[PDB]
Amino acid sequence: LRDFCSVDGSDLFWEWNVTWNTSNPDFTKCFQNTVLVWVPCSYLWVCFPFYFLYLSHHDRGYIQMTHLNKAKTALGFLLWIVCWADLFYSFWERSMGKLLAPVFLVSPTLLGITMLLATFLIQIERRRGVQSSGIMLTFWLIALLCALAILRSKIMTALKEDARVDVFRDVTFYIYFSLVLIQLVLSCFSDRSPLFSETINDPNPCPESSASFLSRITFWWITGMMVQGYRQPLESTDLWSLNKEDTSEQVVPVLVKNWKKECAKSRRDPSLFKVLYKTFGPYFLMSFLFKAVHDLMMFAGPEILKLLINFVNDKKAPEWQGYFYTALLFISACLQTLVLHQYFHICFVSGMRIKTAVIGAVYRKALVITNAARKSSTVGEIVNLMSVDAQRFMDLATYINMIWSAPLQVILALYLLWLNLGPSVLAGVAVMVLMVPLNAVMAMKTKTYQVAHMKSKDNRIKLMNEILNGIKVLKLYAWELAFKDKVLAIRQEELKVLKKSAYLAAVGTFTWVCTPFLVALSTFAVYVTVDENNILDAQKAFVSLALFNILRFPLNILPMVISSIVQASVSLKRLRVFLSHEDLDPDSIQRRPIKDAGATNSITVKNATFTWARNDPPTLHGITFSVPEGSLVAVVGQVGCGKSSLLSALLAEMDKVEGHVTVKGSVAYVPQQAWIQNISLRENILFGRQLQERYYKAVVEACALLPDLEILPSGDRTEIGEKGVNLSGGQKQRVSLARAVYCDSDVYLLDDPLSAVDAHVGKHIFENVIGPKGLLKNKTRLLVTHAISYLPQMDVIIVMSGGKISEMGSYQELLARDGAFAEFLRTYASVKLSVYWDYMKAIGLFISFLSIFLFLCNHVASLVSNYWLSLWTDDPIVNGTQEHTQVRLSVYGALGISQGITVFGYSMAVSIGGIFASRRLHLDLLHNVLRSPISFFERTPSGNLVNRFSKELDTVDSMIPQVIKMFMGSLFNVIGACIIILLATPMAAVIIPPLGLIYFFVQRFYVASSRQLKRLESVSRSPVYSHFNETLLGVSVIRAFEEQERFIRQSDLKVDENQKAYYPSIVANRWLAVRLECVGNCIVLFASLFAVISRHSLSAGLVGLSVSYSLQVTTYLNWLVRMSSEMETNIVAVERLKEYSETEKEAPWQIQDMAPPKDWPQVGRVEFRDYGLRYREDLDLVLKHINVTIDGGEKVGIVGRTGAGKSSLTLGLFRIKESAEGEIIIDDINIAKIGLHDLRFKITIIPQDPVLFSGSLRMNLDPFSQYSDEEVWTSLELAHLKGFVSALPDKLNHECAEGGENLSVGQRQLVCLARALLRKTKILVLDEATAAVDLETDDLIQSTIRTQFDDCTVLTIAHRLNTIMDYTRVIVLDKGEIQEWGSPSDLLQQRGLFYSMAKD
Ligand SMILES: *[C@@H]1O[C@H](CO)[C@@H](O)[C@H](O)[C@H]1NC(C)=O
């Protein structure tokens, strides 16, 4: 090996005297001229073949011949030349006689070949569309570093006066060096974008496909957006456009193809795992490569620390080895950071692609499912496939690799702790084996308690929705406090479960914070006690600690990853069982264009049997009927003959068990269950088509849409709201028919459309759109309908029976032949820093001080424990042994035990404070809302209230405490590392200014932009799920109008808009990570460097402490900025839950100082002193000096035309809104001065709402639970329902469904009647109750009045004048002024407005 570098093999290859053990280090000549030349060449060669395979299988176009790349190839040639120059000189010497070894001829040969390959790679790169190449930049970096070694070597060996350095090879090498420097300087630039670029036209293209290699691996291309986020906000129009590789159009087809292939090779169910692997695996193995490199380099720290400590001990060492070590430490750290975050990028991008592909596949699949499939599940479970499952497949990609990484890191760490610390490391492995059962049990019971929390919060959410709906009823009856207490009890159960979770979380924090210390104590005890000879130097500790600090994470993350793989396995089963469903047959109903003149009837069927399942009783049996072109046919039959199925069959919903059908032309469908999208009514109608003003106006004036818009606020542009804000049944039917009539298709399959419309508007719709002279006069129109008042105007009427077509023919023959239809007719027709203070005050100032104190204790104890381990490592060896071992181990264990006790203390304290604050903020939100006037409920949307009670409160309950823990922990770890550093090597304060204040103000831009981006992401995730719901609901329409491509495209566009926000957030995380990890690596470098500058003073255990802490700052800083961002996002929940604490609340409820007597409703007098109310200040009063002093016991009604205000009469009676003017006095009492409940109780009411609540009917009969079953049944019987009451399973405890759906309409009516009876106050009311209940209930109330309510004054608002006919008096009014009073009969005799209505 020496005959190669020297003729006689003289100049050695590695003489430690020259390279390591000297104050002036320098590689030998053999080394310079073999290995320092074979490193870069070897690199380029090892990366050439695979790089070429890549540039073959990945092109970006072709790049014009620019300048930069010209100069690059020119320098490559000059390098080839100035490298073969050495070879020509070498042969000039060989031939000329001197005996020269192989090296002096083989080195320049390889160098020249590799420079030529550098030129060839530049040209291949240019022809493959690569602007900035990572392989070339790295090759030039390696070459330049090796060349800098060789160049220092030559410069030294030349400056001396003794040796006459060769002028020739030295000149050639100076040349090679300048050229490689310029080539590296030119590898960091970019070329001119390729000339075949197709996405250049996009105004906002992702800045990544055009970014340097340096900007990429440092994610520097998001600095623009992160600074923009600070200077001014980020809306959805600054979000870049997705890379083409991340769009749904270039992601979903590949997964769909692979899935079809797997299924085809199946027809052993298809394994979605194999497909996800075959699709997203190529891009996901690079994650394995980067993670492997990161794992192997995470262990350079501990080893370079072992070397550095051996240095600080060896005080005969040359001062430059400590610098070599500080440099290697810095460089390993920085490579680890870049590699790690490239891996994280790959994983997050692969999860993003998986989610896009899955949402797309699910959506495209729902539109082909056979009806049986969609029945085999619910709509909620088919939308979860998007909402829960795909999110799991997404969030898993980022951790899955730990399955194999965590064991590798733990194994390397154990092997190193062994190689360093002997067979004692079993003492730590034993604690680790006992952390796995605990972590497993805890991760189990955490889910066990989360399930209970969710099942108990869904109940509260349901009750809260019911209350926010029946706000009015509850506010009238005075039932506020009862529902308050019910919801509070459900809350208490939730809180108990959450406290259990708090104990579990406390134990978890104990583990995460005290794993390294427990492991270290076990190891050190077993080591210093199993043998006296064992000495605890600064190298066995402070190298073992590092391995512990980098062992905790694997241990504590492995159980979470296991549980998440399990959850994802369940999700994958669900998703596969969906994507495997049987699909409809596209070719069962064979169609034909509108011009193919084969058959002259738009429809023909031959004995076709149909069914909704594979083996059930076919609903339709042997049909045959051919509807000629344009002929209007109308199928009729008793309910359940097979009517509603002929349409669903022609539309290809059912399964053609046997037969043959064909439909010629474009179809149109108007099913019985109308389907209306969440867009503008006009947008619905046009159904995505070029508006043609004339035809739109026509179709709208046809189906009687004009009288419909007149009420809806904005007109046809009226956004129908949250899935049909206000539209009503007949309205929805008309809108659907408008859609069908606009589409203007050949065959119109009308499925009992006009059913929900009255006879009059119905006949209009027929005559205008369906009739023989309507809009569809020249369309082949079917009609499966009930109303027999049109069949004459028809063309053919078909009737069936139990799925068999009874008889067909014209109405003429239909009547003549006296056939079945004869029977059918004859039968049927027969943050400003105060949010945080508020959260702290809700937790309680004491518990806050306690949490801070216990944190401080934990961390002062940890720090002093480590300074103790240091002072222990510095114990002198006296007589081959270490003194003070007993004392030191005792104190170390004591400090650690105290640390653990304090970590448990503060975790439990912060969690118990979380419980206190959850309880308090919830109670206050509840009380404030329940006190808000009804105005606050009409104005503010129910969405806001439901959101505060669900999500804002979930944040205050189960997210803030954890974030507070992680934030405080990261903050104090950073502060502690900094204390240890500044104390070991005090001349490091000169790094804090230049390194924290100015590169820890990266968090300005991060926090700022990350907030906007998280918002944009969560504001854009619901659209996908709403679309998918709205598509599952109306899939028959979408499938019958041939509008499937449009909807697939809209799903893709929504998924892409969501990704356009999800992608910059991930990259912002990588931005922050690289920046703050660079800061942490600078901390590592500076601590190590100031420990080297000052050896002679520092103590050789202090250095280990300092560097060991420097090696954790790196992760702590990043987690700290992330948790600051989270605290800024989550704390706003405390400002949300406090919104309604200053909103105008209603008047006081109880007034004891002016308390009303027990018999407050003594006389039932009705004094009206020109009172006046107006819904709002801006509007006009609706009571115009209303005046009457009604005596008690009376029985009078209140009637008025539209805009009369009797409704207002009520609203003001109970004081739902304060008195706008005037007065309303009773029994010498100005109700405006009485206590809200002090009056509401004694004034009965039968609100015009049969609204029940989720409870045992007894609850409705008595929410307060202040009524006895005796009088309960007394009412029920008296209430004319006691019979079916006893008919209930639980006589008085028959708990009903939500809203009282288990009771009939008249049922709930009688229910209100009994409510009033039980109340049995002095005075009562019945607001338009006769207009929503048969005469039975109205008359039963009248009988209760003449017999049970005779004593009760009565002012009643009803439209059925007869409902007040026999009443004592009567009054009306308009424009806010009382119209006429006194008896009703005298009114009629007066021929007044009452006489008018009577004429009506
Ligand atoms: C290292 O050792 C050899 C003798 O073993 C000696 O000749 C050589 O000069 C030493 N290296 C240096 C730089 O002195």
- DSSP string covering 521-589: HHHHHHHHHS-SS----TTTTTTHHHHHHHHHHHHHHHHHHHHHHHHHHHHHHHHHHHHTSPBPPTTSS
* d(C-alpha 693, C-alpha 1380), whole Å: 50
Closest C-alpha residue for ligand 1 atom 10:
17
Two structure tokens written together for 780: 């082949």
SS3 readout for 1017-1049: HHHCCHHHHHHHHHHHHCHHHHHHCCCHHHHHH
Tell me how far the alpha carbon of residue 16 lies from the centroid of ligand 1, in angstroms: 9
| Residues near 801 by beta carbon (within 8 Å), at least 6 away in sequence | 637, 638, 641, 642, 820
Query: Do 568 and 392 contact (CB within 8 A), yes or no?
Result: yes
Tell me how far the alpha carbon of residue 28 lies from the centroid of ligand 1, in angstroms: 12
Two structure tokens written together for 1083: 């901390």
Closest C-alpha residue for ligand 1 atom 14:
17
| Residues near 1023 by beta carbon (within 8 Å), at least 6 away in sequence | 1054, 1057, 1058
Tell me how far the alpha carbon of residue 732 lies from the centroid of ligand 1, in angstroms: 100
Ligand 1 pocket check: which of 13, 15, 20, 156 to mutate, most ligand atoms within 8 Å of Cβ? 15
Backbone angles phi, psi at 317, to 5 degrees: -85, 150
Q: What's the one-letter identity of residue 717?
A: R
Name the DSSP letter for residue 206.
-
Q: Which residue matches tokens 């969609």?
A: 374
Closest C-alpha residue for ligand 1 atom 7:
17
Backbone angles phi, psi at 270, to 5 degrees: -55, 140
Determine if residue 598 is labeled as part of a ligand binding site.
no
Query: Do 549 and 299 contact (CB within 8 A), yes or no?
Result: no
Determine if residue 640 is labeled as part of a ligand binding site.
yes
The SS3 call for residue 657 is: strand
Tell me how far the alpha carbon of residue 27 lies from the centroid of ligand 1, in angstroms: 14
Determine if residue 257 is labeled as part of a ligand binding site.
no
Closest C-alpha residue for ligand 1 atom 6:
17
- Name 706's bridge partners: none
Which among 979, 965, 974 has a CA at the least distance from the CA of 1111? 974
| Beta strands 747-751; 667-670: pairing state | parallel
| Residues near 749 by beta carbon (within 8 Å), at least 6 away in sequence | 647, 650, 651, 667, 668, 669, 670, 782, 1040
Tell me how far the alpha carbon of residue 40 lies from the centroid of ligand 1, in angstroms: 30
Determine if residue 1088 is labeled as part of a ligand binding site.
no
* d(C-alpha 33, C-alpha 216), whole Å: 35
Closest C-alpha residue for ligand 1 atom 3:
17
The phi-psi region of residue 802 (left if phi > 0; otherwise alpha if psi is between -120 and 50; otherwise beta) is: left
Strand order in the sheet with 1166-1170: 1185-1190, 1166-1170, 1224-1226, 1229-1230
Determine if residue 642 is labeled as part of a ligand binding site.
yes
- Name 306's bridge partners: none
Tell me how far the alpha carbon of residue 19 lies from the centroid of ligand 1, in angstroms: 11
Distances (CA, A) of 926 to 457, 920, 954: 15, 10, 15
Other CB atoms closer than 10 Å to residue 545's CB: what's the count?
A: 25
Closest C-alpha residue for ligand 1 atom 11:
17
Query: Do 242 and 206 contact (CB within 8 A), yes or no?
Result: yes
* d(C-alpha 208, C-alpha 882), whole Å: 60
Query: Do 628 and 600 contact (CB within 8 A), yes or no?
Result: yes
| Residues near 1325 by beta carbon (within 8 Å), at least 6 away in sequence | 1210, 1213, 1243, 1244, 1245, 1246, 1354, 1355, 1356, 1357
* d(C-alpha 9, C-alpha 12), whole Å: 7
Determine if residue 306 is labeled as part of a ligand binding site.
no
Determine if residue 643 is labeled as part of a ligand binding site.
yes
Tell me how far the alpha carbon of residue 90 lies from the centroid of ligand 1, in angstroms: 29
Closest C-alpha residue for ligand 1 atom 4:
17
| Cα-Cα end-to-end distance for the chain | 121
The phi-psi region of residue 216 (left if phi > 0; otherwise alpha if psi is between -120 and 50; otherwise beta) is: alpha
Q: Which domains does the chain have, with CATH numbers?
A: 16-192 (no CATH), 217-396+987-1097 (no CATH), 424-548+834-985 (1.20.1560.10), 590-828 (3.40.50.300), 1252-1319 (no CATH)
Tell me how far the alpha carbon of residue 18 lies from the centroid of ligand 1, in angstroms: 8
Determine if residue 1205 is labeled as part of a ligand binding site.
yes
Which atom, in ligand 1's list, is nearest to the CA of 18?
Answer: 13
Cα 63 to its chain centre, rounded Å, is 42
Query: Do 1292 and 1257 contact (CB within 8 A), yes or no?
Result: yes
* d(C-alpha 887, C-alpha 1287), whole Å: 82
Closest C-alpha residue for ligand 1 atom 8:
17
Helices (H) and strands (E) in the chain, counts: 54, 21
Tell me how far the alpha carbon of residue 372 lies from the centroid of ligand 1, in angstroms: 89
Query: Do 1083 and 973 contact (CB within 8 A), yes or no?
Result: no
Give, in degrees to the nearest 5, the angle at Cα 642 between 639 and 647: 115
Which atom, in ligand 1's list, is nearest to the CA of 22?
Answer: 13
Query: Do 551 and 459 contact (CB within 8 A), yes or no?
Result: no
Tell me how far the alpha carbon of residue 17 lies from the centroid of ligand 1, in angstroms: 6
Determine if residue 1189 is labeled as part of a ligand binding site.
no
| Residues near 1227 by beta carbon (within 8 Å), at least 6 away in sequence | 1160, 1161, 1162, 1163, 1164, 1165
Closest C-alpha residue for ligand 1 atom 12:
17
Query: Do 435 and 511 contact (CB within 8 A), yes or no?
Result: yes
| Residues near 653 by beta carbon (within 8 Å), at least 6 away in sequence | 371, 584, 1036
Closest C-alpha residue for ligand 1 atom 1:
17
* d(C-alpha 72, C-alpha 47), whole Å: 19
Helices (H), 267-378: 272-280, 285-297, 300-313, 321-366, 371-375
Using CB distances shorter than 6 Å, the residues near ligand 1 are 15, 17-18
| Beta strands 1224-1226; 1369-1374: pairing state | unpaired
Ligand 1 pocket check: which of 12, 13, 17, 29 to mutate, most ligand atoms within 8 Å of Cβ? 17
Q: What's the one-letter identity of residue 351?
A: G
Q: What's the one-letter identity of residue 496?
A: K
Tell me how far the alpha carbon of residue 1 lies from the centroid of ligand 1, in angstroms: 19
Other CB atoms closer than 10 Å to residue 1298's CB: what's the count?
A: 15
Tell me how far the alpha carbon of residue 1303 lies from the centroid of ligand 1, in angstroms: 106
Long-range pairs of 967-970 with CB within 8 A, sequence gap ≥ 24: 967/1120, 967/1123, 967/1124, 967/1126, 967/1127, 968/851, 968/855, 969/513, 969/855, 970/1116, 970/1117, 970/1119, 970/1120, 970/1123
Query: Do 467 and 925 contact (CB within 8 A), yes or no?
Result: no
What sign results for the dihedral spanned by CA atoms 209, 213, 217, 222?
negative
Query: Do 366 and 405 contact (CB within 8 A), yes or no?
Result: no
* d(C-alpha 767, C-alpha 790), whole Å: 10
Other CB atoms closer than 10 Å to residue 1226's CB: what's the count?
A: 27
Two structure tokens written together for 874: 């510095």
* d(C-alpha 19, C-alpha 27), whole Å: 6
- DSSP string covering 596-648: --S-SBSEEESSEEEESSSSS--SEEEE----BTT--EEEE-STTSSHHHHHH
Determine if residue 905 is labeled as part of a ligand binding site.
no
* d(C-alpha 1072, C-alpha 1070), whole Å: 5
| Residues near 335 by beta carbon (within 8 Å), at least 6 away in sequence | 297
Name the DSSP letter for residue 882.
B
Tell me how far the alpha carbon of residue 86 lies from the centroid of ligand 1, in angstroms: 30
Query: Do 614 and 372 contact (CB within 8 A), yes or no?
Result: yes
Which atom, in ligand 1's list, is nearest to the CA of 16?
Answer: 1
Query: Residues 981-997, buried b or exposed e (16+ Cβ, 10 A)?
Result: bbebbeebeebeeebee
Which atom, in ligand 1's list, is nearest to the CA of 15?
Answer: 1
Tell me how far the alpha carbon of residue 280 lies from the centroid of ligand 1, in angstroms: 58
Which among 1232, 1220, 1235, 1218 has a CA at the least distance from the CA of 1167? 1232
Distances (CA, A) of 186 to 70, 71, 123, 124, 214: 11, 9, 14, 17, 13
Which among 789, 780, 779 has a CA at the least distance from the CA of 759? 789
Which contiguous run of DSSP H or E holds residue 1230? strand 1229-1230
